[PDB]
Each structure stands twice: as C-alpha cells, then as structure tokens.
C-alpha cells in the first residue's frame, strides 16, 4: 500500500521549484487542505 502525505512534517524549502509542479500534495497544501498524522505511529500499531 503506497502513501504520500502520511501527515508527516514538510519543510517550507522542498516544494518550491520543480516539486510543486509534479506533486499534487503541496498543491492541496497551498490551498488549506491539510492531512494530519494518526495518533499511533506504525511502530506503536506493530508493537500492539
């Protein structure tokens, strides 16, 4: 199962330039659509 936003941290210094052309996720982010992270990480779910 592939995933993109994963609700994890983005610097303000990656999307500018070619990225925001090829990548829809900051296109969405630059319009107030925000994916948030789950409370349990995949390490905590694997631990349970």
């Amino acid at each position: 199962v592939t995933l993109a936003d994963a609700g994890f941290i983005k610097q303000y210094g990656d999307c500018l330039g070619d990225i925001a052309a090829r990548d829809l996720i900051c296109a969405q982010k630059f319009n107030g659509l925000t994916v948030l992270p789950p409370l349990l990480t995949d390490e905590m779910i694997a631990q349970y």
Partner: protein
C-alpha cells in the same frame, strides 16, 4: 526569497519570488498550476 505583495502587468498577489528552473517558450509570460493560479512569471524588465 521574502514575502511580498507583487504586481506583474496587473497580476497582483502575495508570495515569495524565487529563481525558477522553468523554461518558458518566448511567447509565454505566466505559468499555472492545477488549482488555476499563476505559480511562475517572466519578469518584464529582465525576461528571467
């Protein structure tokens, strides 16, 4: 590399200007993204 209220030929807006890697053909002045908005512009006084 700084946040500014720009205006290019009446294209008013707000953002950071940066040197692009984009390669606009001579007849083009504005570049746009999926959300219908100019994300790249040719500077009239220098053609960058």
């Amino acid at each position: 590399n700084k946040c500014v209220n720009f205006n290019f030929n009446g294209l008013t807006g707000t953002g950071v200007l940066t040197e692009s890697n984009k390669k606009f053909l001579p007849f083009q002045q504005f570049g746009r993204d999926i959300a219908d908005t100019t994300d790249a512009v040719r500077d009239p006084q220098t053609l960058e």
